[PDB]
Each structure stands twice: as structure tokens, then as C-alpha cells.
Symmetry: D2
Amino acid sequence: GKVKVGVNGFGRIGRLVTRAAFNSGKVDIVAINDPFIDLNYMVYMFQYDSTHGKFHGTVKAENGKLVINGNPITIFQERDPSKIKWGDAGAEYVVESTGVFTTMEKAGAHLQGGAKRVIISAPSADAPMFVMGVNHEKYDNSLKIISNASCTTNCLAPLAKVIHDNFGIVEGLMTTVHAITATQKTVDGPSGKLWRDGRGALQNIIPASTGAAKAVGKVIPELNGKLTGMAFRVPTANVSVVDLTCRLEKPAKYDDIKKVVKQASEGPLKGILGYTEHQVVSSDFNSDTHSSTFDAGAGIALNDHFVKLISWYDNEFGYSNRVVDLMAHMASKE
Amino acid sequence: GKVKVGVNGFGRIGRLVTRAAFNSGKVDIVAINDPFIDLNYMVYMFQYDSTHGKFHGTVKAENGKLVINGNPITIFQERDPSKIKWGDAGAEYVVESTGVFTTMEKAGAHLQGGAKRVIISAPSADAPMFVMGVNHEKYDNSLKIISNASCTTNCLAPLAKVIHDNFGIVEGLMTTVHAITATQKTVDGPSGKLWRDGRGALQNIIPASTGAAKAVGKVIPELNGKLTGMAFRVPTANVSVVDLTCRLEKPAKYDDIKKVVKQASEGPLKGILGYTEHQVVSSDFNSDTHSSTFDAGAGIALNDHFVKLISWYDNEFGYSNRVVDLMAHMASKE
Amino acid sequence: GKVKVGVNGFGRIGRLVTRAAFNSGKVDIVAINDPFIDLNYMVYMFQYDSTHGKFHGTVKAENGKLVINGNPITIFQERDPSKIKWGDAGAEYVVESTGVFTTMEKAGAHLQGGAKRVIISAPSADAPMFVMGVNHEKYDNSLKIISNASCTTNCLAPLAKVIHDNFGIVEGLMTTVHAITATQKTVDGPSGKLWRDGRGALQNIIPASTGAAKAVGKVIPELNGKLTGMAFRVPTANVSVVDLTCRLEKPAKYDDIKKVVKQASEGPLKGILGYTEHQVVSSDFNSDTHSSTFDAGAGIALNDHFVKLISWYDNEFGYSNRVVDLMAHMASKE
Amino acid sequence: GKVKVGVNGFGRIGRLVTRAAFNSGKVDIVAINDPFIDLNYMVYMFQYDSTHGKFHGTVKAENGKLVINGNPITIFQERDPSKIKWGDAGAEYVVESTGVFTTMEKAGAHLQGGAKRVIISAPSADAPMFVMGVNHEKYDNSLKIISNASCTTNCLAPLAKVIHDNFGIVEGLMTTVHAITATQKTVDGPSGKLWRDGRGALQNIIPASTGAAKAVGKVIPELNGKLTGMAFRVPTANVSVVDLTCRLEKPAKYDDIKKVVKQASEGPLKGILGYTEHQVVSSDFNSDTHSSTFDAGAGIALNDHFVKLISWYDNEFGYSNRVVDLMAHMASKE
């Protein structure tokens, strides 16, 4: 890979973006910042993964650097992002993955240390938002701070694009049945801002608010105000599913929907939007790099204008690979 | 607390209908048939329950009878339902809970042994179907074989009744996020007729078919052909949730929906349809006897005619208590 | 008449000690300190519990106080325990349940605010340690700061006392198969001090170190240096089990072990050490208030001097009730 | 010159023995019998696996045969094993994996249809039993029906061999914390012979009896009568762990035990007995083909003669690979 990348935060998104970068070879990770995880612990956290298995390659600590597949990575331990010397480490792009510096003002602190561009691996209240395969062609070299939206927006937007382009979405309501995440608790504990999210993750189906369907309206401006939804967190370690109930303007028989989604999966959205007619379940998408995989057998139509469409997503690996693809696309435009 | 009842099958539904009968005191269990579970094992299965806790009372085997709280229950071990001597044991109504004698022809075999009425604790292809609080007033003494529909139909129908009575449901699509059931497998195993249902229940979100939303059109005839849906089985031991996405005829602001559902929960549907504004999760409904509990905070409206309504249900205890309530209602009409 | 109690920390132990105090009525909770959980959130966390169900009585926020069953409780939000005004609230005993002030020096900070005695609801490196039914008669009025040991020590010590008193333990090695706890992570995350404990709790069996078996040697001085062990954390929300493999001095047939444990459970250790011959599983002990329940059917003897003994414990409810029992015992000695 | 194999049963062991056979290339599967799983369903069950992921080769149904990586496999659907035409399909060795024909009389039914040898992939009450790396050199050409013991015996026997050879095991007691299996139930259900095994697998820690430690005494005659144990089934989909508490004749410092086990893992037991000092958890052994992996950091010594040794095993893939290794060894002796 050609662009040199720095990763802020070695949490689940930071580690899996690093794993995707080395597995795909599309970008070169040269620096990682994390003030709470030391070098020897980073080796362990990167090498072993309960969900995705052992890293396929070599990882070791050598001379104060994390060396992955022979590539040395400078390690920083700064709490203040404006103090990270990204430029001295050669990091041109920075993936801001901590989840706490998501505004352009906060993510822009990485420019002080010499980074040229910042990619927020989460929704942002004000940064331009992108979804690969949907609006990445709207990216240009003047944008120094951008967001790759969320894993759920990356699942819904490619499907919504195909459905809207062929039949027109009059309105839609989404539910995502989502795997557990790092912000949840093992047993009933404090969450403060989101009380239901503090309840034991192993024991419960937990309703949760999500701006993912509304965010599709920013990535596909014609759907602004036409979509909203919510989520249920369930006790699975990984892989989630979107359930889009929509009204269509043009009549669409279910076989016509299958035809256009299959055609999009084989052409312009290949590798982004998948298509299957197999009797799949969530574990079949573990470590799958697609953003969205349409499940033809799981959906149901009430009539030609009112349908429920189902799409699977590995909420960890699909999204992490899209962060890398977005950076590779950005690098090709330099 | 008067009608004498026989229970065919000591599976999950049979045992919890028996527990609901002794806890509510509305009906008297006098006989149980199960050809595969012997008396000493019935004591154990009834006394200890992983989901609902130990039985609060006494359970013993004495002189070939199952004795619960000092009440002796005759135990039969017949494979052929037409050979069960219900009349001789004093059982007036029989709960057909095995899941394999759901047609009126098959469930009618209990009349040969002297039962007066049969309540199929499952959907039936041809028996009259009832949901307490929705169409139980249509029951008449002439009906000897009836069905109490499924746990999911009992959750959706009370909510759909209130919404349709106040705003009119033009069309709706339902998703149920359902707890695991006895027909699922611990690890990937054979299912044959439903391939996805054989996949490991602890590891997967599994899409599944349900006739529950279509069945609401039989208990609420005005909704015939206007509702359908599907399910996702998730790894929780009990408690499920319905997500109804519907198009309304009259405009309904979300606060107007909350007001009419709250009013119904405090009046004609008290004890059947619940209402909450608390930050609840699924475990909060464990052993809850309501058929449906509207979650005001979890639902979302796109506009005044297109909304997503959420309702919780203890798929084991709500349904089992409704079987007892249906029999008590039937007894009051004799 | 009842001692007035303050609880420092409204985490899992703090809330369940508060619940055990109201359920048993043995002590009066008058104050709670927690700098991270505000009053409205305390109402929610106390009222709903995924593991133990909804609180039986009433819970509400009124005039800045937490009102449980009509009893108002003063709420403090201090990070420094020496600044908590326990005396202004009338709190005589303080339960130090945060897990971070476990030395006599740190727990003693509560005496500055007017508390008379402090009970550390966790192991302490230097405070006198007690296990109800084993050494609580060694408590005296001169001890202002004491520890109630851990949930695991309270399970092992009553059983080890009976076995050692009757047959003599030459040596023993313990394994506890433990339910998940609040210190674990939902998905692979940072733990720093204990790397295995950061691994996803829902996906893994995790080995862990524990000083519980060694601590039994401090509560039963004759067993000092004769016991040690380790733990496996497994994905269950609650209820744990001890597996004690010990070498006995006097020969003990397995029926002789059952006889002495049953006799102890019916006499001096009634309510502390339970005994069962039923085919129990972990969920059968959910919300069980015993410290230890000997499982006669699960254990196995290789010979008369080498046996494996099994004992269940609700790691949340047994221990929380023992904290209340220890305070009631202390109050009776004033 | 590879042996042609028939597999009776396409359950968990049958499918993973087939997968190990194609992955290792040590034998050629030419036939599979299963009366309950038809050809199209076998394609699906083999292709998708919740635990071990998708089969990365090719699988399809063609002309009534199951074709894996271009190799056609004859499919039989016989309930009676004496009616399976193994000889017509060219199957020389038959893996009897149903768990229902484990005596030499029942497993010998495969000789009627033309098989030359039968390998029971489970313990047998009377067939000669083997563990690769421990007693496979005792196999000879006169043995037509043999057993590969259980996954647990294959974990304990290699470790017990090394410990006994170097220090002498005076006596030992084993506990296995075992992942869930196909014989368990998703929710509390019937298991007439083993009541605890019917209890909900997702909710419980379930004690269970196992003859695995006693079976080590048949494979290592010098340990006959010196070992026994029990199991706890816990809610993990795969990977189990053995906890051997043993008294040693020669003094053994824990570092001496580590040295001896590490040396065995690098020499005569390479690929059978693993050794690690890493901070591993169960998911780190998912799809690991070792029979046993000694966890140096998890074990604990009370003194030089009384220790607790921990060893991990992928109860599905380690055992399935040993069945293939045993057949490859048998074939080399023809």
C-alpha cells in the first residue's frame, strides 16, 4: 500500500482497521497512539482475537516499536491528540477511532502534529460523511477531516441506493438487530447517558436509538427525511442485520427486487453489496468484508409497494475494511 | 377457580399452563398425559425451572399421582389421544399442548375419552382462534374445539386492535425478535424442513417464518390480508419483542398513540396489554403475565401515518396465563 | 432498634446489599454514596435487575432522596470517602463496597465523616476477615474496620470447616467455575493488569487467579498453607460453583461426608450451608441466600482419602445477605 | 495409496471428520450414510459451520453424489447399519460416528456391507481403545473394530502420560469445563436418563458424569484405578478445558513440570500435545488440531507433590483430526 497511516486508539475499531490494512495491503500503518495500552499488550491484543481468530502473520515488539509483517510501527501514548507527533512518524492520514473526538474541531487536533487528513471511524455531527459505493465520488482533495459514517449506515445505504435508484423509496423504517459492542456491560452497570445500554448484555434484548437510518439521508440526499429507525442489541459477539420496511413509488415484485440487487452486487457494488439466496444465519458472515449482504430468502413483501428487505453485516470487519478502502480511494485522488 | 382441567403434554407449555393454574387459582388441574415423561421425572421438571425459578409450593409423587400443593393429579401415559380416559379422571377441559394434534380432527380425539372441550395451545389450521381481550367475547358454548393462537399472535393482536380501532391500520409488517425455543439446536444440527432452525441457537441470529401476523387477520377480521411478518431467533432463554411497522389511515402523532394505548391498558385490556415509559430491557418482563407490553420509549415515528411500535412479551408465561384465562372465561359461560 | 447503615458504592454489591437489607429487614439503610450515579439513575438501577427481577416494593426519587418502601435515603456524591457526612445522615455502620478502599487505612476514611464501624464487602490485605457460621463469634466491639471476605471464600470456608472438623484436610486444591462479573468485558478489550480478563466474556472460558482458597486459611487458622486454587470465568450471568479436591486424614466414605454435611446444614450452619441430593443446575440457585450448597450427587470420590466436593453459590445474593447478617450480628454485640 | 473411508452419521463428529479428511489429505472419504439428512441438506450442513466457518473448498450435489473439492462421495440413507453397501462404494474403513452403535457387536454391522475395519469415534464398552501419541503403536492388523476413545480422554491421556512418565501420578481427580454439545437442550426439556442434561444449555452450568479419566487407565494401564473425575457443561459453543489435580510420587517444582511438558510437545507428542505460556482463553483454541494444549500460566502448585494442571482442547476439531490420524496409521500397517 502507498499512503502511510496513523491510528488513534487501539480499541476494537483501531485494531481491526490495522488488521484490515495489513490483510488487504491497501495502506501502510506506520503509527498507533493509545495512552492506556502499552506496546507488549498491543502485541497480545492484536495477535489474539476471540471473534476473528489469531492474526495471519507476524507481530512482535522490537526496539519500542510494534512490528507487524516486518513493518515497524511507532507507538505513542498521548491523552491529548494535538500532542501526537504524527508527522515525525511519517503518518499522512490519521484514523480517529476513539469515539470521543468526532467533531471537526476535536478531530482537527491531529493536524497540529503533522497529519494531512483525518478519517473519523464513526458518525460526526459536522464532518462530511461518506459510504463507499454510495457517495465516495463526492470526496475531493480539499476535505481534510471526513467521517466514514457507522457500520449500520454502511449496511443500509448501499441497499437503499439500489432500491431508490430502481423503484424509489417513498418512506422507510429500519430496525437493526445488532451484536454486542464494547460500550455495553457484562452485568447490570452504570451507563448514565443511555440507561438501557448499562443492562447486562448477556441476558437481554436491549432497545437502542441509532441515527443510522437518518444518516443515510445525508449520504443519499434524495432520502433526507424519508428514513428513520431503531436498534435491538442482542447477545451475539459479532454480526448484525438490518430490516428495512419501505414503501416504494414504482411497483416492484419481489423477484424484480432480487434481480436489481443481484445485478448491483455483480457490477458497481461488487465487494460492497453482497447477494445470497442461501439459508444463511449470522455466523455465516463472521469476518465477511462486505458492507451489506442482501438475504433474498429472509425478506417478505406484503404487496408491490410495501416490502421488508433484510441485509447482513459483519459490524466489525465490513466497516473496518471500508475505512481502509476510503483511505485507498482518498490516496488515489492525491 | 372451578373448571377441572386435563393437560396433554408436559413440555414447556404444558408445565407452565400447570404452574399458571396453581399460581392464579382460576382453574383446577386434575390430570396430565405424557407418554414419554414418567411421574418421578414430572416432579423434577415441574419443581425446578431455569427460567421461572423453583415452584413456590410442594411437588411430590404419591401413589402414582403428581401431588402439587396437596392436590393429586392423575397421570396418563397414552400415545393415542383417543385412548386418554379424561372423563374418568374428572377433566372437563383438555389443553392440547403437544404441538402435533392442532387440527380439529386430531384435537377432537380428546372428546372420545370424555373431555367436554379442547383448547389447542398453538395455532390451528381450522379451529376457531381466540386472543383474550380481542375476540374472546365471540366464544360461545357451541365451540368444543378452539385454539388460543400463538404467543406472538397474543402479543400483536391486542396492540393491533387498539391501533386499528383508533387510527385504522391500512397495512403493516411485523418483525419479532424471539427468544430461543425447544425446536432449536444447541449446536449446528439437523432440522430438515427448516434448515436455518438447525443452526446453533447460542451462536446465531436466525431468520424464521411466522404466520403470527397473518393470524391477527383471523382474530381481527378487518385486518385480513393487511399484515404479515417474519422473525429473528436470538440467543436469550426467554422474553421476546414485536416490532410492528404500520401505515395508519388517520394521522396519529406519537403522543396520541401513547395516550390511547395507555388508556386501553388501564381499562378494557388491563392485565393483557401493558404500557410503560420506563427504560426497560427483555429481562424486566421475565415471568410477566401480560400478553403484550407497549414500550413507549422504544418506538419511532417517521411521520403521522408511518410508525414503528414496540411491544414486549414473556413468550412462555404470558401465553400460558392466557390459556388459563381463556378456560376461566369458557367456564363462566357454561 | 435496627442499626442504621450507609452504603459506599451503588455497584452490583452495593445495590444487592441494599436489596438484602430491605428484603430481610435486619438493618435500616439510611444513606448511599456514589459520585458517578445520580439519584434518578439509582431509582432505575435498584428497581430493575436482569438477574434478580424487579424489586418487590416501591422505589422513587423524592426531594433529593431515594425512597424505598416509604423509607427516605440520603444520597451523597463524594469521590473522597473522608468527605462523606455519614454522621449527618445518621449512618452508624458503613458498607465499603467500591472495591478500591479495601485496606484499613483506606476504609478508615469513613470514620472521619462520623461512621462508627466499616464493613469492607471484599477481601482486605489487613482488616480482620469474617465468614458467618465459621468465625463470626471471634468478632468483638473493639473492631471498627472488618472485612466479610469474598463470595468464593464464603462458599468454601463453611464446607471446609465441616470437612476439616470431621475428617481433617491434609491438603486441598480448589477450582471455582464462576459467573461473569462487572470487571469483565463484553468484547475483547483492555484490562492491563490481567490480560485474560479483558477477553470477551460472552465467548470465552477464562482462567483467573483468586486468593479465595488461601483466604480460608486465615478464617480457619488450622488450614493456613493447606489450600490454594484458581478460577474459570464462564458466560453465565450469575451463580458459581466450587470444586474442592482434597486429601483427608481420616478415611471418609462418600456417604459419611454426605451425613456430616447434611447434619451441619440442619444445625449450626442452617441458612449458611445448604445440602441437596436433587439433580440441580446453576439456575436453581438464582437468588438463593445460602453461602454454600453442597451438591451430593455431583461430587466424586477416588478413594476414602481423596475426594472432589461440589458446592454452589449465588455469588451476588448469598454474599450480599451475609454482609447484612454480619452487620446484624455486630449490632447485637454493641 | 490412501485408504478409502465411509462415514456413518453426518452429525457434528461425522461432518468434522469429513472436513479434517479433506483438509489434511491423509485419507479419501468415498461414502457417507445418514438416514435423516438428504443430499441437498448435506451440502448446506458441510458448507456452513457456525463454529469453524465456511468450508473454503467447493461442495455441491451432482448426480446423486456429494462432491467435495471435485471428489464424488456416494450417499446412503439407511437406518440399519448392516444394510449400508460400503463395499459397493469402495469404502474400506468405516467411521461409526452416530454414538448409538458403540459396542463391537453393534459396530460390527458395518462388516456386513463390505467394510474391512470400523473406527468408533466414541468410547466403547468392549472395543480396543486408542489415543494417538499414547498407545497407537499397540494397534495391529488383527483388530477389525476399534475405538478412538472420547475428546476428553484424548486431552487428558497425553498430559497424564508425560506427568506419570516423569514424576509418577499416585492419584488424580479431573474436572473438565466442557462446551455445549448436541445432546443438550436449548431450553429445559426431556432427558429421561440424565435429568441435569435436559436443563437449558444457555442458562446453566450443568454437572455431568464422564468416564474419561477412568478411560485413561485403559489406554495407560499403569494409571488404571488412579484417576477419576466429572464435568461441568457451560454455555460456550466449542472448546473445553481439563483441570487435573494430582498427587505426584517424585517432587516436581512447577518449572520442572513445564520443562518436561514443553520437551514432549517438541518431540514425540508434536501436533498431539501443545504447550503455551501465553495468556490464552478458550477461543484461542477454536479450530486448533492439538488433542491437548498445556496452559503453563493457568496451573497452580500447592507443594512439590500436589498440583493442578490445565490443558485446553478443541473438543470438535482435535478429536476429528485424531480419528483421521488413527485411520492413516492403521492404513500404514496394512
